[PDB]
């Protein structure tokens, strides 16, 4: 499992079959020059790993460290508050700052809010699964949603990435995940090694063996400018899967940290330069 | 797009390659002895159709008639009262029946509760789509999500089919619906014709061009006893797609009644019988 060949394959068959929207207006616009830019996309588009290797990109340079870094900020401390991810040093989310430094109710706090029951114990999303994979493998409701219906106009923004469900299988962990929809340029690449490293979280705490990861796109889309610089990522030698040492003896998920985590041997490509549009 | 040549396959594919549950136990039991009764699934498994026929079974009869009218009850009526559901000569969701006769915050519920604003007004799930739809085709937003986290301990049940997003592109609706488990045999011919009647009745109130129609679902499992007639299903002769009439009068979503569908020329194979395990 290599996500370069299958990075690749979903971009070259959006400049083949895509659909374009220069037919419609609103949103989007360059910085650049400040006026609307459009998209290629197509619907339903699946990548499936075994966990063979790592989901990553070898022809250009992923944030990987910064991808964890978010990860932990939503899942693991369950923040809503910018402010926390700044004593992390990253400032990327710092464009939707509110009021109050936050996003709302969005993220860290639907992953946070105790809604649930266990055993006569209100309990949060992530804590509650965390039980029902050791206390119950068999069960075909292991899901967590990010996309309440009842909250949507108290968030700063709406999440791409919205769901996943998890599926137990014979000592096996199983991981299927979808977006509503993914900039195949920047956001894709991030988010699909950003999820991973959370299967593999859940399953070092449960003690399940690695299964399949399923990453679904809903509105596959590529800025056209973007385009050009693409066709030059899709010429550059790929490289080998880097081995990804994690701090082998956490027990409990509440416990990891940045340190913990290292990518080794992470050869890529140059650089290449992606305009930023909203 | 048979739907039978889809769907064979996916029976074929859980026979040779479908992982057990044995090793588990809870939940599902029959009713001809009342005891552990497991599955077959597989994981990951999607099927689309261009909509040149209509999707729907020929080797077993689907009762289509009554799909439509439970799909009714939830979409257009928003209701979550068994009671509109017996008037219209259905019983087959009488057993959830709770202490008032509401299958509680799930299904129709959901859909009916006003959580989302539009221009200074207080709308839900399904009217807010209705408007986006013409007032804003290219968003990448159109989603309806059953599975509310806040209420899934208020639901008399969990829904198999909970989510679906609408995407426009060119003029054409296209819808794309997940289901978290389904039930091949008994359930699944159901639920898949019951949406292709909702594609297109959302399709027509609008005004857009029928577009492509995706269905996914995540434990695509299989009874063990279902096996030996499933066996004889796949050998069964295949017939022509039933012409479905919708009466063209119609324009509001609200106005249509079961006598405004009829299922013209339905030839099929005989009877399979598949006992009951819950």
Known sequence: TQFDKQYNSIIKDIINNGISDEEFDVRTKWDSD???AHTLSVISKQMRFDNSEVPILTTKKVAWKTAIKELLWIWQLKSNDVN?????????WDQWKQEDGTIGH???????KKNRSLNGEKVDQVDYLLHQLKNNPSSRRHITMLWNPDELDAMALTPCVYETQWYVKHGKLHLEVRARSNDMALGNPFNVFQYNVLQRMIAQVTGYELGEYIFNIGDCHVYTRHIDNLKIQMEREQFEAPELWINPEVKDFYDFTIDDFKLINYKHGDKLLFEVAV
Chains 1, 2 share one sequence.
Not at 84 to 92: A, F, R, Y
Not at 106 to 112: D, P
């Open 34 to 36: 400040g006026t609307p």
């Open 84 to 92: 926390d991810l700044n004593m992390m040093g990253v400032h990327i």
């Open 106 to 112: 969005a993220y860290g706090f639907q992953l946070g």
